[PDB]
From Swiss-Prot, chain A:
Belongs to the CarD family. This is RNA polymerase-binding transcription factor CarD. Controls rRNA transcription by binding to the RNA polymerase (RNAP). Required for replication and persistence during infection of mice. Keywords: Virulence.
Curated annotation (Swiss-Prot), chain B:
This is DNA-directed RNA polymerase subunit beta. Belongs to the RNA polymerase beta chain family. DNA-dependent RNA polymerase catalyzes the transcription of DNA into RNA using the four ribonucleoside triphosphates as substrates. Coiled coil: none annotated. It comes from Mycobacterium tuberculosis (strain ATCC 25177 / H37Ra). The chain holds residues 397 to 445 of 1177 of the full protein. The gene is rpoB.
From Swiss-Prot, chain C:
It comes from Mycobacterium tuberculosis (strain ATCC 25177 / H37Ra). The chain holds residues 104 to 152 of 1177 of the full protein. Belongs to the RNA polymerase beta chain family. This is DNA-directed RNA polymerase subunit beta. The RNAP catalytic core consists of 2 alpha, 1 beta, 1 beta' and 1 omega subunit. When a sigma factor is associated with the core the holoenzyme is formed, which can initiate transcription. DNA-dependent RNA polymerase catalyzes the transcription of DNA into RNA using the four ribonucleoside triphosphates as substrates. It comes from the Bacteria.
Amino acid sequence: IFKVGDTVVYPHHGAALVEAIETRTIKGEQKEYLVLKVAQGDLTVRVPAENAEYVGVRDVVGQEGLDKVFQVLRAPHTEEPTNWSRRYKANLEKLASGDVNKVAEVVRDLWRRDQERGLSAGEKRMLAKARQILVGELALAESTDDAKAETILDEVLAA
Amino acid sequence: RVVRERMTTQDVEAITPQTLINIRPVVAAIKEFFGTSQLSQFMDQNNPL
Amino acid sequence: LSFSDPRFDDVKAPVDECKDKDMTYAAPLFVTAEFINNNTGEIKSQTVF
């Protein structure tokens, strides 16, 4: 399925393009490396043709999962453990999982707790990073005008 | 030294070179060579010779 | 983690301006880092200042 011209989503680097299929030699054999161009830090990631699904290279989302993550973002549930260390560990695990609904849960919990209390600079950086990957994912998914993706993010945050 | 220290603490699949590399000891080494060394001297100019 | 290919930019301020404004006369340095995963197989090539 991975041809030149896609827009695939890495686990926690964001949505990236493809431009070539490298046949770079490993053990005297030409494993089909595919290249990536993710623009948050202009790093190029090259992965083997079959271990991408093992490491979690996930395709773009363009169906009722958009409504699913919208109702996840506008869900009434907000619960965290008592200690900030375990709460941060659980949110970091859900962030590193690389799932859109889980990242939506992370940003709704962090945005609710920041508009209620205001926690910390480290979780502020975490919320900025997770909001960046969610906004970039949906803006390259629906092709829906990035930063007007931020306006529709404001709409679903207002709920 | 700090690259091979922080390489193992934070997890795999999340690290990048820009989070691995800390250029502060390199730039401090260059600055502490060019200042406060006895081989980087003030240029002795009274005349061209 | 691997480094390769140093490369310099242009000087940010000329000689007389650097001598007058009490600022050092330098040029930026760029190094193409590369982070390789052995067992899984990935390369994260970047550009580090």
